[PDB]
Design a protein around this ligand. Structure first.
Ligand SMILES: CS(=O)(=O)N(Cc1ccco1)C[C@H](O)Cn1c2ccccc2c2ccccc21
Ligand SMILES: CS(=O)(=O)N(Cc1ccco1)C[C@H](O)Cn1c2ccccc2c2ccccc21
Ligand SMILES: CS(=O)(=O)N(Cc1ccco1)C[C@H](O)Cn1c2ccccc2c2ccccc21
Lengths: 472, 476, 475
């Protein structure tokens, strides 16, 4: 009995029911990964390095194979005498299609195919069945449906030496050269001058962050949402969203640990669904997207309102490169490109600026940039959020003033836009109003070193509010 | 020329605003301001429902001022710092306010009047938050507020007829008085959003209680229509004039009952509000037990765990937990529901200080102004204003009489929806098999009742009897 | 059965239940301290703690193993190299310690190692106090005392590790032990130790136990020692001071508690002492209880127990405060004693903390807490952050001139720690900028040259800061 587990998401040894089932009764086990901005690639490679290091602790290794799954697996079936193939289920339409092709190939070759749901809290198809064959398109209806779902089963036991037992991994002395985790440089990325990631990849990092997150949520929040402060825009050591997207952290483990901690602090009380809002919003979008192959499109998407967005390549590139001339917007887009995560409030600000608020550019162009740059931009959640914020499905931020109340000194701007550090707080959000003398001392002339504002926000927002009303 | 500022704090309305009307008279310019401190001393999100309501009151005020070719000025800061700069910057000669009877408000307004006088600025103050000039009620009573509602009603009966509402502010009232405006008004003086103020808005849905005068007047008309066959949030913020409410009630009675001498019970909600305001205005410790001269000193139990269970809707009594859940989620609960949970915390079941119930209500209740909140909690706990012993509300049986199926419980406590009506108010009595059918195990998914109500109420009734026997020996 | 006991705090052989359990049924025992190469005085105190442990372990035919590195890297190698089956630690309630220990516990589980954890840094299991309170820490000392009074009696101190306790258990040792596992020098940690004088606070369990006996002898001569007054201690370090030894674990708090009861029973001939007898230990326990579940206890933002105050960011003023260059001799003398010796009187802590925060400079208490963490020998994370929040009004304005003049009228304490000021008469030593030039000339200290001018006007600064605090407390 030769077992292979195929990692795609679920890049972890904890709560991996497909991997545990695959090892059961197996003589041999091999785990494979078969191989977007530089930050996303880097995070992925660090997840794989961490997987390899943790498999080494079990006297195993990760097998990274370059090629296409349809080509690689038939050769692997014969070469490794594979009797069992396991995957974590992928609900996303492109993933479902690819997995159906591999399942047929494996089944025809006499390979047992193990598929287990562990990327989401629930079986999304069962939610859709409870709703009469269509996904819920409102969060309240989704929550009503979740309330009627069966209590979630406990997380699978972590893959340990005891679980592996006598199952072994055949290895060669040339493993690193033939199956090693590639570097960014091997993939052709220019890494000259790249600094260390603000978001280290991998399950080990994810699990330490989960423990910190639970401790602050239970005792430092009384299980409530705390107020935002100046530093809330900066990457948190408790942030989990990239780890949930790549599968370094099980959403089911998070759910159980959160419930158990609530039960300890609130004796024998069951928590309100608001306690799981981040996980539930994530499920809602996965459920909405699973049967819609055009979820990320306007045309051909039955749930999306068709709106005549402008085509403006110059405006879009300015937005994407953080050259709008509004430092608050430009600072966010700069943090997005440099680090791969920005706060939800920051996402709303720049998405509104691009779509309904200022530039009137399609939400698809905003989604594609976020897809390249955001570590936690799962296809379903990214597309659904952009449609939601643009008033394109599911039924105005000032680009100058909004940030100042929580960040009056403009410390966030200064962190990410060094060209503006010379400006006093009076002008840091609106430097085009700084006198020439201030610009000269700051060594930043507006229109020269830093661009003038690309639009008049008051006039642009007014026209766009009118356009949205006329559409609706 | 004559530059006038009207300072909004309460009185968040253009109808029946005599201070604003007097301020416009003889003015070349008028600017309306609300002063908001953007600094938050706490990390908690718990007062979000009250903040959202206030912001909607301010947005509605700004939109109505916009119809008059004006704007609302929301100024960030503290009044003592802001007003001297505004006096010089805008060349202000007149400042108007609606009177604030609360002791902290009176102290603050005396300081601003001193600042205005030192700057050569005239201060206009008009009473319009209450039906009566509270000071005249107290003077009529010999210098002290009445301590019983019956005595208060006798005083009201000897008061002069209620003042008619002031004219609504319109183009005609404003006339040639103008508001200087700038293109940067929204950046410097716009109504902030909840997110701008630092609140996390993720768990918010549509408000059940939208703020603002426009909504208040609409709800007033509906309230009168139903009565022919709740406004307290709007009254607390001044979105609705209590004097207009009084006149509308008198008019409806004159139409329906064909008399001009209505019984005072017709205005009972307004008169109870007036009564607590009168008791509070001259008492700076009115919201305290210790040091409060009108408050009976009672040795209430100290129990932080029990108080937190009451506040968080984890008592194990579904009727109580449902009310406390609606209070947290929406910011308003019915008068009878307040009686029920207030009794359970204090005289009825837990014997916890009324100060603790007031603090939770202050955080959560949209209409919990300082005077009425403190007054109501002292009243129901038998700490002051004593006229009678109260009914001990049953945390199981009271709700079942009008809502036998427990639909209110099911709305707010989804964990209990599986239970049949036989056990919906007392799920601890459901057989283990029924709990399994309900998919809710008592002691696991939903807590057991935190007290035995029959034993707790019996002891607390005895405690109250001993207390009032001690009071009669004192009084003689 | 190969057992390792990991010292972090609890640097002692008396009342060490984790170590005692670890030896029970073990064929081999190794005691380790993990050091990754904090001001000089804390490092010096620590190394003396370790030298003391090593010498006492030598009496038991053992040695201390000092291992250079990070615990997460070091332990998996030690498990394999020494075939370790058992690892023991004294419980660390502090949030960072809890995270580190959970990480090592996972490593031990992967290696098949059983982890023994015993509570002995605190009087009580802090989690039990919190459960007795319904799941939240008490937020007042009065509430904390109510809870303590209803707890089961404090555990008795465990027996000291002696040869008979060790029994047939042995410590494998090599001739190169000192070369690989010896206690490091200050130079190895990179400190320049040239010019260092003797510590006023010698580290270690041996010093702590003798100081405990002397401390009990002294309280016996004090009227109403059941109601103790720490604020009546001298400004100079006490021969019987115990607070550094409690912080590092050289002295068991449970032993101290039992000896206080015993002294009360001997002197006051009753077994029912008031809890005030244990005030020093109980205040310490209260801050540990408040902090154990709050990972942001040492921060203002995101800390539910902390009032949010808009403190100034002023690095230069902070550096003057931290380095004792404020120009106020009382403040500067305290900060100089703190830097040179590692301990200052509780009222001296009040004085400088008020000056930094609400009183004069309006700098965050978090910045003051960090300097104390570097310099103060007894600044446990819990007590340090909790005290700094209290003193900054984050849960009376001291005069930086008059408070010290009343506490030390001749100004001899100032002269001791700021020798440049020794020439000034008492009339000016607390405010030497007011000394006439002729007096400054005779003193050989010109203000603005040999000693700085005062960095703020106390009268204007305190008046403004009191106003700001009122605006905050309006909410
Ligand atoms: C109002 S919301 O439902 O849109 N929303 C707010 C919220 C938080 C908790 C509850 O609600 C959730 C959003 O998904 C947050 N977010 C994303 C997340 C991942 C990937 C992309 C986006 C993205 C893009 C543009 C705007 C926002 C976005
Ligand atoms: C118009 S009103 O708001 O003044 N009011 C009239 C009235 C009648 C008797 C006393 O007050 C209606 C409210 O239901 C009265 N009420 C309570 C009742 C029981 C228990 C607590 C409260 C409580 C707390 C905070 C604010 C109000 C409160
Ligand atoms: C408000 S307090 O005075 O009651 N207090 C609480 C307390 C602790 C023990 C007994 O009491 C504080 C103390 O007095 C004195 N102290 C400390 C002591 C150890 C460690 C750090 C500090 C520290 C830091 C900054 C200001 C002062 C400080």
């Amino acid at each position: 009995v030769n077992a292979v587990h195929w990692f795609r998401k679920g890049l972890r040894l904890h709560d991996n029911p497909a991997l545990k089932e695959c090892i059961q009764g197996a003589d041999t086990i091999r785990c494979v990964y078969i191989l977007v901005g530089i930050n996303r690639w880097r995070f992925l490679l660090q997840c794989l390095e961490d997987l390899d290091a943790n498999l080494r602790k079990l006297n195993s290794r990760l097998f990274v194979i370059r090629g296409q799954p349809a080509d690689v697996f038939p050769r692997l079936f014969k070469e490794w005498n594979i009797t069992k193939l396991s995957i974590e289920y992928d609900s996303e339409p492109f993933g479902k299609e690819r997995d159906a092709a591999i399942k047929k190939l494996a089944t025809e070759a006499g390979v047992e195919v193990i598929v287990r749901i562990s990327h989401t809290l629930y079986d999304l198809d069962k939610i859709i069945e409870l709703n009469g064959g269509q996904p819920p398109l409102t969060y309240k209806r989704f929550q009503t449906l979740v309330s009627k779902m069966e209590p979630l089963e406990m997380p699978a036991d972590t893959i340990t030496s005891d679980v592996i037992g006598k199952c072994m991994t055949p290895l060669s002395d040339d493993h690193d050269e033939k199956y090693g985790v590639p570097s960014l440089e091997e993939l052709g990325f220019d890494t000259d001058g790249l600094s260390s990631a603000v978001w280290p990849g991998g399950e080990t990092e994810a699990l330490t962050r989960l423990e910190r997150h639970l401790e602050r949520k239970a005792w430092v929040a009384n299980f409530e949402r705390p107020r935002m402060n100046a530093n809330s825009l900066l990457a948190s050591p408790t942030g989990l969203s990239p780890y949930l997207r790549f599968g370094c952290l099980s959403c089911r483990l998070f759910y159980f640990k959160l419930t158990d901690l609530y039960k300890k602090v609130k004796k024998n009380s069951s928590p309100p669904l608001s306690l799981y809002g981040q996980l539930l919003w994530r499920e809602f979008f996965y459920t909405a997207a699973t049967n819609n192959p055009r979820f990320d499109k306007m045309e051909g998407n039955p749930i999306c309102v068709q709106i005549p967005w402008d085509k403006n390549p110059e405006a879009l590139a300015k937005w994407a490169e953080g050259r709008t001339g509004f430092p608050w917007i430009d600072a966010i887009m700069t943090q997005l490109r440099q680090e791969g995560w920005i706060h939800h409030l920051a996402r709303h600000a720049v998405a509104c600026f691009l779509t309904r608020g200022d530039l009137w550019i399609s939400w698809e162009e905003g989604m594609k940039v976020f897809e390249e740059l955001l570590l936690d931009a799962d296809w379903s959640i990214n597309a659904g959020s952009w449609m939601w914020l643009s008033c394109s499905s599911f039924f105005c931020y000032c680009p100058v003033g909004f940030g100042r109340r929580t960040d009056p000194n403009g410390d966030y701007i200064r962190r990410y836009l060094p060209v503006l550090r010379g400006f006093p707080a009076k002008y840091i959000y609106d430097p085009w109003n700084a006198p020439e003398g201030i610009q000269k001392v700051a060594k930043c002339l507006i229109g020269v070193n830093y661009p003038k504002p690309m639009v008049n926000h008051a006039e642009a927002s007014r026209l766009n509010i009118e356009r949205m009303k006329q559409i609706y």
